[PDB]
Symmetry: C2
Subunit: 275 residues, 2 copies
């Protein structure tokens, strides 16, 4: 159910616990949270065979009076669960007169984290919430966010096609995915711009340019084809920047033909207007 916090009396508190008893109380804090727990007048015993409060994978089993040394006394230390569920167990054997010739009990209190905080043991072995770029530590679970562009559909894990990234402004910057790091392969991209009618576009490339090339046949691996006003104007590849050009039109289409194994760095560009 819905449990902010609560109090667990050992049954009959503060009147002593009845001997011969084993009752379990189970916390169910809201799912996706961690529980907190603090306070113990019971019978000490080495290893707590006589009496013990078993509490949780297993946290511990202890017994004993508060200010008593060599009685395994638990105290008031915090201990957080990994998941939404907490488990208490109370066991008192038949004798509260152990070490005989004839204990009140215990009254405690109970009350979240995010796997982006420290990636407990690994990122790809537990049920994968992790993200390559980043994630956020919030109250109410955890969601993801990546390097800007598309918003990584429903799973929010992967950080994702180039259908139409739109741009209808005069001058802008366009870079390949994740520049200057190695470019992503196996992509058929289209960057299209239709500028306000009555202009041509002045173009100026930048370095280091990087597309894996072949010096015997130009651009078998990757291709960078440029379609002007509806027609083909160049298949570029290599490492050194091609020279500046003028379009003489008000609208264009750019496309990217990449390989299936990326070693190179990429390509970055700038475009301006002139009347």
């Amino acid at each position: 159910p819905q449990k902010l916090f609560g109090e667990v009396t050992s049954p009959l508190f503060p009147k002593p616990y009845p001997n011969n008893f084993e009752t379990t109380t189970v916390i169910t804090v809201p799912t996706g949270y961690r529980v907190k727990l603090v306070f113990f007048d019971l019978e000490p015993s080495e290893g707590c065979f006589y009496d013990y409060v078993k509490i949780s994978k297993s946290l511990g089993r202890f017994c004993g009076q508060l200010g008593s040394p060599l009685g395994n006394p638990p105290g008031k230390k915090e201990f957080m669960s990994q998941g939404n569920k907490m488990l208490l167990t109370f066991h008192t054997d038949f004798s509260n007169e152990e070490n005989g010739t004839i204990y009140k009990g215990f009254l405690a209190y109970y009350q979240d984290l995010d796997e982006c905080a420290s990636r407990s043991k690994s990122g790809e072995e537990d049920p994968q919430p992790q993200c390559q770029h980043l994630c956020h530590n919030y109250v109410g679970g955890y969601f993801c966010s990546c390097r800007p562009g598309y918003e990584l559909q429903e799973d929010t894990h992967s950080c994702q096609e180039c259908s139409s990234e739109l741009y209808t402004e005069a001058s802008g910057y366009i870079s390949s995915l994740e520049y200057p790091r190695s470019y992503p392969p196996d992509l058929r991209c289209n960057y299209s711009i239709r500028v306000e009618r009555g202009l041509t576009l002045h173009l100026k490339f930048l370095e280091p340019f990087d597309i894996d090339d072949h010096q015997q046949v130009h651009c078998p691996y990757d291709q960078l084809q440029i379609y002007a006003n509806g027609k083909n104007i160049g298949e570029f590849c290599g490492k050194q920047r091609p020279p500046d050009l003028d379009t003489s039109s008000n609208a264009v289409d750019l496309l990217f033909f990449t390989d299936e194994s990326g070693d190179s760095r990429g390509w970055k560009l700038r475009y301006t207007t002139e009347i």
Copy 2:
């Protein structure tokens, strides 16, 4: 109202921002909480005079910055977390009349996110525990969603302020053998208290008594017990005004019911007293 999370767009996003503009968006997450905020394509400038985004917590200046992302020496913010002291967040967006720098006329804007992570004053204590308002607990406290409350001494529950953790009205005991001590042994006793601990055993028995060490009640050596008094009423009548440093001796009650009473001074130096009782 009810605000889990949300995003603050520079007006007209992703289309560029209109110059001559100053719009302020204020987060009001539920009270008793903190806001968290992370992401910026704006105009860099030394000191962010041209354009700047001015942002602050409860009642304190966080910062004012600007500049493009991969730009050094532009005071660029990034996506770093910054938590408020309080429940209310304050964003301010300022654009001067000129974004047209280098003869190279223009920035998309900014699209951010804010959350409502709780705060629990039992987690830490900024500079001290006794200097911040309503010091909720001396002993311990609890870290919960919606603030923090306290509780002490499994008897009474620390009246209205829920700060102090203090009275001995009637602490009852109807068991055979038990241990009784002054409050907070072996440490020094609280003075100025009129306490009454009484026990009535099932009829047909007497009670054997055995003190424990070291006994301590502030005394005077010429006339006994001026500051503190330890008066003991058996079967309804008085049996002793005891004080000093050495333990009194064992006794036999000869009754099925008794009454204890304690007269404290208003200044404690001693430690206290501990005892054990059995049946016959």
